[PDB]
């Protein structure tokens, strides 16, 4: 199958590349090389963007 995780809290972008979501969206990781900041696809919304990886648990 496929993973996803659920956004634990709330997030507006700090950057032009960040992406906004909303807690419990959930969200697949698209790459995560990039230490803290992991690049996420929400299933919620279809939007795309850098995330802090703190504000995600396991779905």
Same mark, same amino acid.
């Given at each position: 199958?496929? /993973? /996803? &995780?659920?956004? +634990?809290?709330?997030?507006?972008? @700090? /950057?032009?590349?960040?992406?906004? &979501? $909303? $807690?419990?969206? @959930?969200?697949? #990781? ?12 929400? +299933? /919620? ?5 850098? #995330? *802090?990886?703190?504000?995600?648990? *396991?779905?």
């Amino acid at each position: 199958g496929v /993973t /996803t &995780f659920v956004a +634990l809290y709330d997030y507006e972008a @700090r /950057t032009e590349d960040d992406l906004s &979501f $909303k $807690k419990g969206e @959930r969200l697949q #990781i698209l790459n995560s090389s990039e230490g803290d900041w992991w690049l996420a696809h929400s +299933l /919620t919304t279809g939007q795309t963007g850098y #995330i *802090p990886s703190n504000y995600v648990a *396991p779905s």
